[PDB]
Each structure stands twice: as C-alpha cells, then as structure tokens.
Design a protein around this ligand. Sequence first.
Ligand SMILES: [Mg+2]
Ligand SMILES: [Zn+2]
Lengths: 226, 226, 16, 427, 63, 633, 249
Amino acid sequence: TFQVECVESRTEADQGQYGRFSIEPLARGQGTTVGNALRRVLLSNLEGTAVTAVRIGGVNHEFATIPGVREDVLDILLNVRELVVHAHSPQPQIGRLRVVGPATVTAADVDFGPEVEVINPNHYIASLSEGATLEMELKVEWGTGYRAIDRSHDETTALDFLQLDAVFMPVRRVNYSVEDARVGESTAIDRLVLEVWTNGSLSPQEALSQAASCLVALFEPLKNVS
Amino acid sequence: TFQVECVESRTEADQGQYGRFSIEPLARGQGTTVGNALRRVLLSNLEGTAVTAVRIGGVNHEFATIPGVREDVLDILLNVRELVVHAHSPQPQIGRLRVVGPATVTAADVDFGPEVEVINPNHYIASLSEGATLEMELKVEWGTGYRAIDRSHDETTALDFLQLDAVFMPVRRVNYSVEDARVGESTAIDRLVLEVWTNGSLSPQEALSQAASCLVALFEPLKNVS
Amino acid sequence: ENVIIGRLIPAGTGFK
Amino acid sequence: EAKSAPIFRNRVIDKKQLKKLIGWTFAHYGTAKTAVVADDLKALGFRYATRAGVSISIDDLKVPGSKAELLESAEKRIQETEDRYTRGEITEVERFQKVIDTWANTNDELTDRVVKNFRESDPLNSVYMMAFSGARGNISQVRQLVGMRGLMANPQGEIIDLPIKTNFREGLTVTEYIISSYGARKGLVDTALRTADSGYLTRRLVDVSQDVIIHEVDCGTSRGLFVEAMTDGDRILIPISQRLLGRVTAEAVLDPSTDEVLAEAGQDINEDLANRIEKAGIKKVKVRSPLTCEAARSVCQKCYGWSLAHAQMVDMGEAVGIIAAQSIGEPGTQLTMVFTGETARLLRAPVAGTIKLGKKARTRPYRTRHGEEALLAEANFDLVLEGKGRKETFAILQGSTIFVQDGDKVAAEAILAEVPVSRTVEK
Amino acid sequence: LDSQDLLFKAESLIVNSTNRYHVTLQIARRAKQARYEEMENLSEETGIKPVLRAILEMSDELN
Amino acid sequence: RERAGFAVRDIHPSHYGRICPIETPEGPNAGLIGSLATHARVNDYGFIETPFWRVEEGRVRKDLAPVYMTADQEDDLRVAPGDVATDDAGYILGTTIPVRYRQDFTTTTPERVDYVALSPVQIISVATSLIPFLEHDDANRALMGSNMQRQAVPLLRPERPLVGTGLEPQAARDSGMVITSPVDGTISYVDATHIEVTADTGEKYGYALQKYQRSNQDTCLNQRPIVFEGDRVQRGQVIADGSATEKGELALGQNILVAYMPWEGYNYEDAILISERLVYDDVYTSIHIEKFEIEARQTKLGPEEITREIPNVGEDALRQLDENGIIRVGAWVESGDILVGKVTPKGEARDVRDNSLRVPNGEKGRVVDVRLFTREQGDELPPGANMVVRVYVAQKRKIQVGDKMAGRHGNKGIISRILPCEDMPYLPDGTPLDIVLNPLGVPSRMNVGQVFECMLGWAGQLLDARFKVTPFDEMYGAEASRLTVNAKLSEAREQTGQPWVFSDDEPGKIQVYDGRTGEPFDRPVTVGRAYMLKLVHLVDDKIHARSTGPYSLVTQQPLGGKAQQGGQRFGEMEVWALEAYGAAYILQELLTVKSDDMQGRNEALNAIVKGKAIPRPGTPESFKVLMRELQSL
Amino acid sequence: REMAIELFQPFVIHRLIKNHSINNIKQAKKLIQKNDPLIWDVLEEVIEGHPVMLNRAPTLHRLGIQAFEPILVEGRAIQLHPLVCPAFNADFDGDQMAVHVPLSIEAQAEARMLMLASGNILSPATGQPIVTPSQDMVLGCYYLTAENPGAQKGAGRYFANLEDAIRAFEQGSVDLHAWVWVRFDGEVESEGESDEPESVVAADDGTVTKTYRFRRIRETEDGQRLSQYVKTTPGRILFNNTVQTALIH
RNA sequence: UUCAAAGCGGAGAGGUA
Ligand SMILES: [Mg+2]
Ligand SMILES: [Zn+2]
C-alpha cells in the first residue's frame, strides 16, 4: 500500500541540497495530515551541529579590534556563527586556525580532527594585511533549536572563551502540496508532493527518514497501552 | 519518553461514552502535532455501521402520512437515521419490524440477525395508536465518515428501498488542549489533554488505539526506504 | 475631613 | 435567575444585537452568568474572524463610476454662475452662495451613490463589512476614502470656495494638502486645550456636592415633578419610557381609557412597567426627586430611587454626590464642537405641460438667495397646472418660493418650486 | 473547588442580604474569627484561605 | 505659556514655504515649536525667504537664477505651486492654473502667472520629506510618523529601504559621519581603525575611524569601512560610513514580510505579533553604552583613599579588581558588583567606612573603558578632590515582549507574542511570514500609503530593484501610484515565472495557509515587504516595584522616583473613585499604615510576618506637620 | 514574576518560616537573595486567592480602578483581558498601569466583594451594559452569522437537532452559509418574516401542515403542535448553540 | 547588651500615554 519515490535532486553554490518526493496513493484527506506532520517535525525537531564558543588570540571581549585586520571581533563572531559543519562523533571537538600575512582567511583554513568536516570551504572570515596574523580556536557541539547564552558558565577551566548564541537547524525550508490522482472510477485518491531544502549537513533523504522515525516513536506508545 | 493516563471516564444517558486523557511530558510544539493528527484520524478515518436503506408499507401517497401513525414519513426517516447499531460481520444484513397495537415503537422491536446488536434498546421511532399496522425493513452497511446521496431529498418516494444519508462516524466529538509543565527555569515542556465522545459502539480507549494503529502504518513506510 | 485626619469615612462600609 | 429559555435568533448579529443579548442575560440570569456568556462570545468571535481572512487592499476601495460626469456637470454650472457674475447680472454675495450650494449638493449625491454601490455589487467587501457591522468604521471616514473630501474652512471660520475633489485613494494635490492641514492643526490645538477646562469643572463639581450621602429611608412628602418626553416639536428626542426607569411615583397613575390602575403611590418603575405606561397613552407622570425632598441636608432612599449600576433601590450610606459629579464630568472631553441642501426641498415635476397658475396664489416678486428672481408665497394653496395627461394637485407651504410662472413650458424633471421643511436673521 | 464556583457562591451571598455593605463586614468578622481560632497547632484544613472559607461556610448555612 | 493662546498656535497663510505645517509636538507644546522648511533661508535682517522661478509669457525660465522672496513681497504677485507640469521644461500645460493672490486661492489662465515654486516638497520639512506616498495619508498620522522617525535606534547591521523617497543621501551628509574620498586614486591600506588612499603622484590621505563611542542618550557611535585593499576609487565616492547609514544614505529600520489579517486575538487594538526569526537572526538588536563615575574627595576628618582593602568583605567579592581597587577591562559585571573600592575616614581600632560604588540594580554588561584622572599629572580637577574614575559598560539588547515598533506612516504598536516559526502562516512556496498586522487600524485612520509601500516592496524584492518615488507624484497622470505598482507587480510576475505572485482577480492578495493545521484561510490576504523601526521606549526601562525603602525627611512619606526605590502616588481622583465604591478600609489602610503612620508601619509589618492581626492605626504625621505650620503663623 | 517577589515579600517570609522550617528572618532574606528554586514554589501558593488592584492614569470615573486575581507570567509586561479595555479606556500602543496590593483581612474581603472585575456589568451613569464584544469579536460574529449567495454546497438538507448539523459541518460536507432545514421545537425570531400563515394544506385525517417562508409547522385537528422545522444556516446554529450551552451549564 | 550607614531640597528644558 502506497509508494514513495524521489523525482529531483540538486546542489547549489553554497553546497546546499534540494529534494522532491512523490508519495501515493493516500486516501482522501490523508495527504494534509501526513504533510503537515512531516513539515512540523522537520522544521522543529531535528538535531544538528554548531559552533558554540571561540577564542581569539589577543582579545578578551567582543568590542575589541586586532591591528591589521579589516574586521572587528563582533563582525568575526557573526561570520563564524554561520559556519555549517557536520560531526560524526557525539563529543565536543576543538578546531584550530593560524593564518599570517596578506590573505583572505576562509573556512578552508580551519582544521578539525579526522571526525568533523566542513561543508562549504569558501566561507569568508576576515581579511588580513601585510604583517598581521590571526589565531583562533573553535568549539563545536550537538543540540537542537536555538540556544541563548546564559551567563552562568563561569567555569575557570574554560578561561577566556567567548560564547555565542547557537543555532542548530539543518533544514531551512519545507513545502508540500496534495493533488487529485483519480484512477477513473469514483475512488477519489490522493497524491502528495513534498519538497525539502537542507543546508548540506545531511541529505534530504536522511532528513525525511529521521522525521518519519521520530513520528513513529511518538505515536507508538498509544498503540496498545491505552 | 512520555506517559499517558486516563483521568475521567463517564457514561451518558445509557448510550454514549466520555473519556479524557493526559499525555506528558512532550517537547515544545509536539502537543499541537499529536493533537491535530489524532483529531483528524479519529473524526474522519474510522469504520462503522449505519442504516442505509429502509422500506415502509402503506405510505398513502399524494401526501406522506402513514395511516394510524402520529408521525409522517419525514419524521420516521429522521428517527430511524439516528439508530446506533454494531455489526460483527463484514457483510450487509437485513432487519424487520412488524409491530402492531396501541404502543410506542422503540429500537427493541427490530428483529436483526444474531450478527447485529443494537446499542440503545429504547430509541423512539413512532407511536402506533389503536388499529394501525407498521411494516418496516432496514438495511445495514459498512463505511467511513458522513455520506451524502445526490439529487435525492428525504421526504420523497423511490423504487422499493429508499436511500438515506448515513452517519458512519463512531466518534462524535474530539477536543484537545495544550498546557505548560515547565517545573523550573529550563526548556519548555508541553502537556496534552484530549477529550473523546463516543456513541457507545466503542469505548473511548479502543478509538485512540485504533487511531494510533492507523497512524503508525502511515509513517512507517517513509522510514526504511527514503 | 476624615480623609485628612485618617479616619473611616462615614459612607459605605464605614457607615456604622 | 433561571428558567427563561433563549430565543433562536435567526438573523444577522451586529453590535446592537450583542448589546441587547447581554442586557437580556443580565436581566434574567444574574451577574455571574453574563460574564460566562461574554467570554464564550469573545472566544467564538476571535476564532472565526481568523478563519475568514479579512484583509484590506487598494482594489477593495471601490469608487463609483459616475464621479467624472457628476463633477463635469457641477463645473458647467459653476462656469455659468461666474459668467453671469462677470457681466454684472449678480452681486458678489450671491456668487459665493451659488458656488457653495452647488458643491454642497454634489457631495450628498456622491455619498448616496457610494453607499448604494457598496450594498449591491460587493456586500461582503471588507471595508463595507467592517463599517456596516459596527466594528470600527464610520460614514464620514468611508466618504473620504472612496468619495470626495468636500468644502473646508479657513484658519478663521470662513469657507474656501475651492473644494477638495479627490479622496485618499486618488491622492491630494499640493494645494489641497494645505487646506486639510488647516483643520488638522485646529483640531490638535482644540484637543490640547480642552483637558484643563474639563478637569477644573470636574473638581468644582466634586467639591460642591461631596456631603450628599444617603442617611434616611423616607421623608414622607407628597411633592414631585412631572416627567414627560423630550420632543423637538413634531419629532421626539427622548421617549418617556427611557426617562421613567428607576423613579418612584408620588401619585397613583391611571390609564386614560378606563379606571384601571397601573401603579400605586410609592412604587419604583421597572422596564416592563415603563413600557406599559408608554404604550397606553399618558404624557406626564408625577414622580419623587432629589429636587423636592425635605430631609436633613441630604436625600432619602425613596426620593432617589434606583442605583443604576445594580438595578435596585440604593443602599444606606451611599455617596451619591461623588457618583453624580463623576458621571457629569466624565464625557466632558468628548464635547468636540456648506449651507441649505436637503434641509429644504426642491419640487421637480416629472411631466411636460403648460402652466395653469393664473392669479390664484399670492405671487409677489422676490429676489432669492442666489441671483434669480421668483415669486414668494405665504398663502397655502394647492398648485393647479396643466400637466399633459392630467392636472396638478401639488400643495405649497407658507413662505415657499415658486420659480415657474404662467405662460411657460415645463419639461421632464424641470425645477418647479422650493418648499421649506419644518429663524435668526443676522447682519 | 473552582474560582467560578466561588464567584457564583459570592453572588448568591450578595442576594438574600438587603444590604450590600453589611455582608462584607460579616464575612470579614467570620474570616478573622476562623483564622484566630486556627491557632491550635493542628492545622485544620489550612490549605484554604480564611476569606474563601468564610464564604463557603456562609453559603452552606444558606441551605 | 499661560499667555499664549489660540491665535499664536494656528497656521497663517504666510507660513507657505517657510514653516512646516505638519511637524509639531502634541500636548501643551503644540504649535509653540516649529521647524524650518526644506528650501527656506534667513536673510541679514532676520526674515525667512524662499525661492521662485520666473515665468515669461507662460514659459518657465529654469535657467535664470531663482529669486528669493519674503512674505510681504509676494502678495501682489500671482504665484503657482510646484506641482504644475511643463512640456519641455518650458511652457506651462493646461488651461486653468491654481494661483495665490493676496493670501487667497484662485485660478487663472497660464499667460498671467508671475512665479513658480522650485519643487513639490518646498512646503514640508526634512523629516516629513522622507515618507513615500504621503499624499495618500491623513495629516495627523503624517505628524505621528514624522515625530516617531526621530526616536528610532541604530541597529547592529543597518539596511536601506526598498521604497525610499530620494532625500536619504542628503539627510545623512550633514551629521559628519560619512567619509568620501577627495582623491580619485587608489587605496593602499585598509583596517578597522585606519584608511589610506594614494593619488596619482599626489601624496597620501589618511583617515582614522571612531570605534564604539557613546552619544548623549547612551547609543553607539561606530564607524566602519566599505572598501578593500587595492581598489580603484573616484572622487566623491563613499569610503567609510557611520552606525546609522548604509552606503551613503540613512538606514533606520529593516524590511520584513508582512501580512494583513487578524490572529487569534493577539492583534487586538494595536498589538503586534512577530516571529522568532527576528530574535535568532539578530534583526532589531542594538548596543547601549553607560557611564559610571566616582569621586575621591578630602574631608576635615581626613582624606579619602581608593584601595582594595575594603572592610567586611570577603575574597569571593574581590576577584576582578586590579590590586588598585578598580575593575579590569573585559569583565562581566552583574548587579550589585563592586566597580571602584573607596573608604572614608569616619570618626569613632579601625576608623574607616565602606561606600564603594556598585552597579545599580538591573544593569549588566562588559567593561570597555576605565579611563582615570588624577593630580600631579597635568589634569584639572574640581576643588578638594584627588582623583576621578570613569567606567564604561556596554550591552546588547534583543527585541522582546513589551517593546515598541513603528512604521513611517504613523502605525505604532507593542509586541505581545513571539511565535515559533512553524506556527506562523506561510506562503504558497513554504516561506513563513515575519509580522501579522490588524486591518482594522487602516480605514478609520486613513493610512492608505502603507499598502502602496508594501506592494511596491514586494515587487522590488522579487525584482531586486530598489525603487525611489517622490511625494505628490500625480501631476503626471490621473492615478500614477496605482498604475506604477500594478505594472511593477506584473513585470515581476513575468520575470520570475511563478504565477502565484500576482493575480488579476485580487491584485494585491495571495493565498496563505495555516501553520498549525495546514488548511488554507477562506479568502486571500494582502502580503508585502514593510520597513519597520524600533523605538527607544523599551520595557526594560519601564518596570518598577517597591515594598519598603527610604522615606522623606519632613513629611515621612515614601520617596518618589525609579532611581531611588520610590513609591506610586495615589492622587485625589483615585480617592474619589474609592469613595464611590463604598470602600472604607482599603482607603484607610492606604492613607495611614502604608504611607506615614510612623508607628503603625512597623506594627503592620511585624504582624504580617508573625501571622497575627494588623492593629488599628493612629494619626498620620502630615496632619501634625500642618498643625505646627499653622501655629507658626 | 519579577514584581510579585517584591510586592509579596512579607507573606513569602511568613510562609517560609512556618512551612519549610527555615530559622529566622535573616536566613529567609538570604534565601530570597540567592534565588533558591523553593522561592517560586512558595510564591505560587502565596499569591493564590489574593486579589490585586489595577489602575490607569487619568481616573475619570470609578471603573478606572478594579480588582483582579493574579497569575504569574514570564516577561516584563502586564497582561490585560480584552473585555475590560473600554472601561479603563486602555489601548496597547504604550499605555502603562499601576498595581497596589491589600494587606489586611477587611481590605481583602472588601476588594473581593465590592471591586472584582467580574461584577461590573452595568455603568453607573446609565444602566447600559459595559462589557460587550467590541472590535474583532463583532466582526467574527457578523461573518459567521451572515449569508452568502455563492458558496452554498449542501443546501436543502434535513437534519435532526442542532448537534447533528454542527457535526456535519465540522467534517466538511456543508458550507458555513448554506440554507438547511433543522428540527427545532422552541421559539424562533426571524428577520424579514411573514407573520401571516402561508400555503395551508388541509391534508387527510384533519392534519394541517402550514408552510411559512422560514418554518414548516404541522398541527393536528383543532389541537396542539406536532412538529416544527426551521430553515437556517450552520453559522447561526453554531452561534445559538454556543449561547444556549453557556446558559444551561 | 548597642545600630547603622544610605537617603535627601529647589529651578529650568524636553518626552510618553
Ligand atoms: Mg494609547
Ligand atoms: Zn425625600
């Protein structure tokens, strides 16, 4: 009963990904419930990875400047925060950056371990002049949703680390539409078409599978316990 | 990981059933997803039994009144359209009514086969008065949702069997509400309260189980392939 | 004048 | 506070129906059921105003298609008037009146056409639906969005003979923006300066009447005043039933058809009894009052009557002076304070026939407020004119002005007379 | 125990009174007496506040 | 103020082109403060003038040095408005022309006019000249919008409007914060604090940029560069810009997706419902810098010393001091934290007392500057003082429930809800909206220009165009604004390829779905791009509470003021309201136990804490003060 | 939650001393200052059943001060019910309000019994109602209960009682503005009605079925009424069922 | 046994509802 297949797949210049799926046959009004459940779970309840803290060599607050660098610290923290990254291990990882001389520092200059990988090695991070160097350390983490800074992480072990508001959202747009696929007698059958845009951390197929697995675990405790 | 509990469980004036459930703790936004997905399936996708066709003898045409009966064809057709029946077979049955004498006709007078059971045994259908005979014949079928015939009103005369618009819904009303269960200064927590009204064919706990069973099988095939 | 001194006003619940 | 089953209202529900329903619920069920009913209605309205998707656009602002021809006709009349003025046929104080009256009548015609157009083409228009239902809009505001702004006034009280012939949908010009800013600034300064006067008046009222507290039950009198409806001659402004609620009768009232009594002495009047008194004739009822009660430096419970917030007789030790002062003073800041149009009535005959006026009515030559000359009539006489198929049965009024004299040819909808509808002659 | 039930009970107490300002004083006196007599260290239904307790008791006495 | 009346606060017909008729305050100052118009100037006698072009034989001479004329001069001439249309910058078209003769409005043939105004915006000021589609607005809401445009807050990343009016680049060049290159050369060194440009063998030009300074009202005054190293630069080109300007021009707000429809009661009576994207995308966030000061003086008992040896304090409260008693740069300070440690020589062993300065309650942020001044170093100080210490603390504020938002057309509002993005309504492509506004507020106040602005912003976003429209644009056609907006929307629909963008049955409306259930609303609604501003009235500065604090000296009543733990005043109108209710005990408790019954306050507090009954009050102190004052007379 | 912990301090201290035995007042104040989790648990049960008085700046009449029951919210703004705005003359574009609390038993009883916002139905200047749906609720009721010549799917369908019609509309099978016949034994009030009976059909057995424009009463021979039907709209059924359910429950 | 060191009046200008 009912099949799901993929019609289109693409990849943009930011290394994002797009996918279109066709699910049919449904039964007269079951298109909307399935589609909206999928859209609500995909846009809200998925786990991702983000940069949560960064130490810059020579500064201690966000309203400072480094000589020879075209950007201030506040304008670098807002570029590092948008660095999309995908970790295989379930642990915090630390990446290191050290650039010197006339260059444009780019996300290809950050070197994590053999576990974490960068998705877009053309992200822009600051511009350097002749005789200025940049040293940075980044810390990545797992999570879900939007996490604000709480000023209670005053641990002395993590000394002189600047904290950021973290955003873990691997899916950026979902759309769906239900069409009539009447075979011809009277049966009034449905067909759902679903479009997913991701940021490159995970394929649209993996995102769809994760959402469908979360929904089943949501609706299974009510199956026979009641 | 959540728990579902049955708070209240009443019984209406000998037919209906009422049930309230509390489900907690859920994430933020999952209460609306679960509630709406349950509501749509409970109200629109459960099977049931209803009376579809009826034949009445001695209609006395050019009017609609039956001799010796207080009611007319339209009133009796609306009375017999609210009969609540429950069948244990997937094949349509046939029921007979041959009351006579100065009495009040109720649902207990219908001689259905062993495979059909009447929920309410005292459902007013008519009042026979002093010298009239009432002959009836009823047909029972299976279906889902609220049906509707085309180009046929209720007070009319068709060939032999007269068609009706059946109500196959076993569930009459569903309500849901989402409340806060934060308990502290941490991530928001949802609690869902769900109320189900049933016509007596099913308990308000078998309806929930059937809805969950139908919802699990919709999302399961979207997990292991794509 | 009872407001100025700080007494119960002779109207309402302070009538008697 | 129960047992009264609601009626099935099979009609549309605007603001007046909601107010009526709330009043009925309070009168029949009490003060704790009205809150529940109001909350339920609020929830239902909030829920179903969102499913509708009510919005506002530029095409929702529908202008009638006959505006251009109306403006063209008005401008042709204005040109005729000014050409008459340039040749010396009329004086300067008549040209101003003529050009003011033309633009005062055109605006009324345009408003009628706008209102008629809304109710026929799109009766579910968002602007029409939200102005007709009584939610926020008005008629002086719908007029300026899809109609015509009209004649405005100087920074003084004078009138500028140049009108604004555009709405806010089409857009004003540089010249009309200034004329509008005049009145905008006038209103702003009025609002700024009214608050001090209102506050000072309220303080004086509170201090004059602070010691009026209810101490007694009855002074035992037989005096009161006569309550009657408030009428402006032919028309009534406030009916007697609205003025007779909560009062106490000082003498037994009687139906003017027979000897059936409707109330005894010393009896408060409710809504049912007020309606019963109003329906069965009766133009005056004698009631008690704080004006005529002889108590010790206050009022008593019987002379005051009901307390309007509770629909009951006043309690003991209630400060009625503070309430009276606050009630008079609260609407003080809401006192926000073109020529003969339809306040007269032109008589146009929709027939073509010869004139049979003769010399029956008293026709004295007269020069009207415009430059034209007509005949002024004071003797009420029924007009007789040969109106093609049949004669005329038209009736004039005292002080009327007739334009048509004998030996003329009247055509379809030609101006025939003017009748004043029912006095300060300034210099 | 609901707030709506308390609202209905207070409205019923206001009626059957003949004076609006005389029932508030009686309720206050009853509430003060109840709270003072609670001084015995047994904590007899200390959950309810004294004014609501007085309203409930006076409504029950109304039969 | 008491002598100015109705005649001085009015509009005179001689203000035309010299004083703006819109921009004024509301309240006691309405009509008493005014603003100079756009083209007006004051001569050496002190009279305001305004320019005109000459008209010869019905031909406008736009090449003959416009003449400036005072109010009395232009009373015998027939002067035409600035919206009259000419065919080749020459002869005046039409047959009847509006003119002003002796403070009256008339119409004449266009062979008899004398002078013509320079521009259609010659009558309004600079703040009112920045409102597009102004001729479709009421005058009161125009006043509101012009007044509210001057209370906006500079944001973290500014952005230009899409439907600007054309005067933005000129309103920003006078504040002196934009840097333009005088060189027509090359750029050799770019940095966050320095720019250098080299000419064609014409030496070097170097500029230094201000960084995170502070204004009179505690707002940032940053300056940032635009260019990159080795860039070809022409004369008059923008090189760096300030904190409230995009490249060259003013930028006070942001462009967001708007829909006009009611939500489930959250739009009720001017309330605003927004999305959660505006919070985590750092839209509408700003930086505010505060200054604190401490003074070390000398006393007859002795001098005062700034040191970290404060009595009755533990080492758990001296972590961030620099062994000299002054906090360190880069420290996070929460409420009740020591900034500078001071001791005074009290007379009473240890004879010093601690009154070091701490941050006021409700303040936090980073320490960014600790500049300090002292004698024996070349610094002038007020007499009797030894040193002065100034500390600067900065913080970043986000939008939240209770903040005020505004638009350019007079529409104000307070934010009441922040919805997660899956609850917001969404478009036929899946994009959730940013803000939902109530349509009940448009027709009763007559701001029709905001709908024009929204529709043109929608078209501009879909085309990437950034249109510019000048006020009073209907001198060229009968309905110019509607035709331009419709043509732009149709062109955007044809260029994009999506048919749902524009519909012919309902031009400005498209279909919108429900994010909670997935069902479409019954009728299409109006969506667009709106330019909204964030005002200086934030709810973090308006909340206050008190239980017990300082009292006045003479009357012994609680002090008043947010900054000194003040109480709320219970005026006499509230006393009248409580008297009308029949209340006797609430009033007496307010008047005595909670205000100035000097002995009943402590008894009431102790009775509440212990759980007993509150005893009866006595005579308040103000009555005794009045009796003493009357006896002294 | 930030104003309640300040306005209600002595009651919190008393409850902390009596239950959850602390010791002295200084320890309770240090506990409040440290922001222990127990503080909010104590406060939530301290403030229930305690009225609070709300006031707006230009108090022009006695309905400018009213008493409410508080609920702890998160944020820094006071939430006000939409049905009390015209009494206060309030509006959500910058307005501010002041909060006072009563201390003694007499003040509490008197605020509950004389000033609570749920007993202020009529106005003292004139006996007209003061709490009515005003702006966006009247628009919703007007839309729900209006009529539409288009979009009339399912017109002319017969239902038994009002709950059946509501259930048929809830799961989409009839429009919100269609004309349907329902069975209703009660009192009806139609607009544009014909008070004179129409289409009287004297049927057999002396039974008479009079058909009006909006009713189909069927009466027995010189006797009482046998049945009644009303031609109406599903939105009107919703409105009237809501009112009746609110009144009967 | 004692408490205890943080509160102050006036004038002018502008703003919000
Ligand atoms: Mg306001
Ligand atoms: Zn008397």
